[PDB]
Amino acid sequence: XXXXXXXXXXXXXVSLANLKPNPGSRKPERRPRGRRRGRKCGRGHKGE
Amino acid sequence: XXXXXXXXXXXXXXXXXXXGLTELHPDVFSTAPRLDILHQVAIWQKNFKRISYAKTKTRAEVRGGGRKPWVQKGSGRARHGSIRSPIWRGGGVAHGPRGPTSYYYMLPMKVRVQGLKVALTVKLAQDDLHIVDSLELPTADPQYLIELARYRRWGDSVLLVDLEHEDMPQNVVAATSGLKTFNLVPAVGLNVHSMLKHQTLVLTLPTVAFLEEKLXXXXXXXXX
Amino acid sequence: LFAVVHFAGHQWKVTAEDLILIENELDVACGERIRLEKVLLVGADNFTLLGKPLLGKELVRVEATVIEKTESWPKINMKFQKRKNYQRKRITVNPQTVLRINSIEXXXX
Amino acid sequence: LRSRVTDRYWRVQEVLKHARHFRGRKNRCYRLAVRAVTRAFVKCTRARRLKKRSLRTLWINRITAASQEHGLKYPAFIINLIKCQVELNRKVLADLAIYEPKTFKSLAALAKRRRXXXXXXXX
Amino acid sequence: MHNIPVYRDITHGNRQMTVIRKVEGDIWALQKDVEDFLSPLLGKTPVTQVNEVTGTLRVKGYFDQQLKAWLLEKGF
RNA sequence: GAUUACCCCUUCUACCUUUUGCAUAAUGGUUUAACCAGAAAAAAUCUAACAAAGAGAACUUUAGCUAGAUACCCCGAAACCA
């Protein structure tokens, strides 16, 4: 059913630029830089 | 059981002939092509080719000495250690690439195999895949190949997989000489990277034979 | 002879030929002619009519025309908290509508 | 390896572009420009919040004046307008208190009329 | 070979969910049949299909015995 | 904000750090440019491969196994030893 629906429409021939991962495949790695968590990078205030 | 029937057009490649008939049964075809697998295979193929030659020098690897530039207190200046410190403009970086590594990894056989299979399915159903009985290049000149690609209205980029690499000089000589459009590669050297690199695929009968043999044996080994 | 209307929760003093900007969109196509209610009416003969909590629909009328739907100059709204590391910057553009008052109708009862 | 390139210089250029007309280093230096910009925006919000208050107070003063010209005070006029079912805003009421003394005179007359009728009905 | 895939999925340590994979025919009809079959037994029909390039049938409960029996007797 | 193509009037107690609490007469900064300080996957969550099997002769396994993707930053001594 998906083969007929993929063969029916004319696509962009799927160039390497058209390659995309499935949703939730790779995590958007968190970077400590920002005003989200200030200056402590999630380590809290002082302490060891 | 659904049997896919693909028409193989035999071209004598001289000129003005699109006429040929052979009945092919590519059981290798898949219903829905996996984009995720293809992407992972491409990323991996890009990954193991990395040289990882990026280098730097941590403060310990700096030629500079570890002597204290001045007294800790009373100097009026800021507290400072060796001048090779990253806080100094004469120092390096701590988190830098200097420590080497290997960006490659071991990908399961079924994944890469299903990758090549799915890619082949993509090229198949995209009409960009054509099957021939043989290949002939009697004149062996660039002009002939160009005018052939223009007259027969082939794709902008065509990957030719025909030879077993052990024969047929007349073709290879002209095909491997100064041609950006067409690319050459043996039937046993066929890979997914080469297929995804080009917008059009052209295979011959022995090539399709060995390919379907390898892919049916790998699919049968993965199913069992 | 001038009138006082009410729209978008705001009351305005309207006169003939006047151009008045009202908040956001009236859901009316440009070029169309619309009618407005009347909070107050004052005639220049010093004759005033004030109904409550509204004026006569049959007695008096107000008709104006919409020129276009514009947007006011962007306003920068920023919230800042001291040593809380809290800063929020938001640029807000207030939508507006240009109304051209044409006919103020007054009839005798 | 990346580079600082034009990013920081463009951000500074933007802040300083918003720092124009400022006095001294604040229209020149970047840091003082930012420090002045934050205060400028806070003051923008606060003054835009208190603008309604200032205008309201001004209008109340004007209406109080125009009322006192007729012999009655502002609160009595407000009460009379409330019992007269008049929802007219103080802005338009002040505009009438300036340009159109006749309407305000009529409203004041009706105010004194309602006040005298209430004081006569209570007795 | 073995008849049909059967996926027992664990979302957490003590929590269990059932997962089926597409085999033969379209998923929609079989899903409707699953709903109609599980409706009298379970009392509800919490059937959900997740389709990307293939498909996954997910329901709330354990029908796996009836699942295997069904897909056996049917032959799909 | 008003106001004039400029200003007076009205509305407001620097930043940062450290703190129960700082415009604080607590801390750091002449200004500007540039340099400068979160790089580790076991178990887990998640995306895919196959499934009583996964994984490129090595291990796990009463739905597992394999692969990928997700979290633990710098500067500073007084001194010791050769």
> Torsions phi, psi of D100, nearest 5?
-125, 80
Q: Taking a contact as any Cβ pair under 8 Å apart, which residues of chain E between 1 and 40 contact chain A? A: 26
C-alpha span between B110 and B116 (Å, rounded): 10
C-alpha span between E76 and E59 (Å, rounded): 19
> Torsions phi, psi of A7, nearest 5?
-85, -20
Three-state DSSP class for residue B43: helix
> Across the B/E interface, how many CB contacts are shorter than 8 Å?
8
Spatial CA neighbour of D61 closest among D76, D70, D73: D73
C-alpha span between B148 and B11 (Å, rounded): 11
C-alpha span between D111 and D78 (Å, rounded): 9
Q: Would you state the structure tokens that stand for residue B24, as one six-digit string? A: 């092919």
Output the CA angle E26-E27-E30, nearest 5 degrees.
100
Label each residue of B110-179 as H, E or C: HHHHHHHHHHHHHHHHHHHEEEECCCCCCCCCHHHHHHHHHHCCCCCCEEEECCCCCCCHHHHHHHCCCC
Resolution of the solved structure (Å):
4.9
| DSSP annotation string for B62-99 | SSS----SS-SSSSSS-----TTSTTSTTS--SSSTTS
C-alpha span between D38 and D17 (Å, rounded): 14
Which residues have CB under 8 Å from D122's CB, separation 6+?
A: none
Cα dihedral B27, B32, B34, B38 in deg (nearest 10):
50
Output the CA angle D15-D19-D21, nearest 5 degrees.
160
Q: Could you tell me how many residues make up chain A? A: 48
Nucleotides of F under 7 A from a protein CB: 1, 10-12, 14-19, 22-23, 31-39, 44-56, 63-64, 66-78
C-alpha span between E10 and D114 (Å, rounded): 80
Q: Are B132 and B204 in contact (CB under 8 A)?
A: yes
Q: Are B36 and A22 in contact (CB under 8 A)?
A: yes
- DSSP 8-state secondary structure symbol assigned to residue C78: E
**Angstrom distances, CA of residue D111 to CA of B11, C51, D72:** 105, 15, 9
C-alpha span between B114 and B135 (Å, rounded): 29
Region of residue C82 (phi > 0: left; psi between -120 and 50: alpha; otherwise: beta): beta
- DSSP 8-state secondary structure symbol assigned to residue B4: P
Measured in angstroms, what separates residue D40's CA from nucleotide F11's C1'?
13
With CA atoms as reference, the chain E residue closest to B224 would be E1
Spatial CA neighbour of D77 closest among D120, D55, D54, D110: D110
Q: Would you state the structure tokens that stand for residue A27, as one six-digit string? A: 């995590």
With CA atoms as reference, the chain E residue closest to B37 would be E53
Measured in angstroms, what separates residue E5's CA from nucleotide F64's C1'?
13
Give the residue ranges of DSSP H helices in chain D.
7-18, 30-68, 74-83, 90-99, 101-122
Measured in angstroms, what separates residue D20's CA from nucleotide F4's C1'?
20
Q: Are E19 and E7 in contact (CB under 8 A)?
A: yes
**Angstrom distances, CA of residue E51 to CA of B117, C78, E5:** 21, 45, 16
Order across the sheet with E17-21: list the strands.
E7-9, E17-21, E55-59, E48-51
Spatial CA neighbour of D118 closest among D72, D78, D86, D83: D83
Q: Which residues of E touch A22 (CB under 8 A)?
A: 52
Q: Are B190 and B119 in contact (CB under 8 A)?
A: no
C-alpha span between B153 and B133 (Å, rounded): 19
Q: Is the CB of A39 under 7 A from strand F?
A: yes
Spatial CA neighbour of B118 closest among B49, B213, B40, B186: B40
Q: Would you state the structure tokens that stand for residue B29, as one six-digit string? A: 């075809």
Give the number of other Cβ atoms within 10 Å of residue C80's Cβ: 14
C-alpha span between A19 and A6 (Å, rounded): 16
Order across the sheet with C33-36: list the strands.
C19-23, C96-106, C60-68, C33-36
- DSSP 8-state secondary structure symbol assigned to residue C11: E
Interruption sites in chain A after residues (C→N beyond 2.5 Å): none
Q: Which amino acid is at A18?
A: N
C-alpha span between B148 and B202 (Å, rounded): 14
Core vs surface per residue B133-150: b (16+ CB within 10 A) or e: eebebeeeeeebbeebbe
Q: Are B114 and B222 in contact (CB under 8 A)?
A: yes
* Largest distance between two CA atoms of chain E: 35
Whether the upstream peptide bond of residue C53 has omega within 30° of 0, thus cis, is: yes
Which residues have CB under 8 Å from B125's CB, separation 6+?
A: A3, A6, A7, B29, B33
Q: Could you tell me how many residues make up chain E? A: 76
> Across the A/E interface, how many CB contacts are shorter than 8 Å?
3
Q: Which residues of B touch E54 (CB under 8 A)?
A: 32
Which residues have CB under 8 Å from E62's CB, separation 6+?
A: E16, E18
Q: Are C102 and C52 in contact (CB under 8 A)?
A: no
Q: Which amino acid is at B182?
A: F
**Angstrom distances, CA of residue B72 to CA of B75, B85, B167:** 7, 16, 79
Measured in angstroms, what separates residue B122's CA from nucleotide F61's C1'?
36
C-alpha span between C81 and D22 (Å, rounded): 23
Q: Counting beta carbons within 10 angstroms of the beta carbon of residue B98, is it exposed (0 to 12), middle (13 to 18) or buried (19 or more)? A: middle
Q: Would you state the structure tokens that stand for residue C58, as one six-digit string? A: 């049959």
Cα dihedral D61, D65, D66, D70 in deg (nearest 10):
140
Please give the helix or strand (H or E) that residue A46 lies within, else none.
none
Q: Counting beta carbons within 10 angstroms of the beta carbon of residue B82, is it exposed (0 to 12), middle (13 to 18) or buried (19 or more)? A: middle
C-alpha span between B169 and B174 (Å, rounded): 9
Core vs surface per residue D57-79: b (16+ CB within 10 A) or e: eebeebbbebbeebeeebebbbe
Please give the helix or strand (H or E) that residue E37 lies within, else none.
helix E27-42
| Subunit contact C13:D95, Cβ cutoff 8 A | yes
Order across the sheet with B182-185: list the strands.
B129-132, B200-204, B158-161, B182-185
Half-sphere exposure of B39 (CA within 13 A, CB side): 12
Which residues have CB under 8 Å from C32's CB, separation 6+?
A: C65, C66
Spatial CA neighbour of C40 closest among C108, C102, C109, C104: C104
C-alpha span between B133 and B131 (Å, rounded): 7
> Torsions phi, psi of B169, nearest 5?
-65, -40
Q: Which amino acid is at B47?
A: N
Q: Is the CB of A47 under 7 A from strand F?
A: no
C-alpha span between B135 and B187 (Å, rounded): 13
Q: Is the CB of E73 under 7 A from strand F?
A: no
C-alpha span between B116 and B119 (Å, rounded): 5
C-alpha span between E38 and C102 (Å, rounded): 69
| Subunit contact C76:D44, Cβ cutoff 8 A | yes
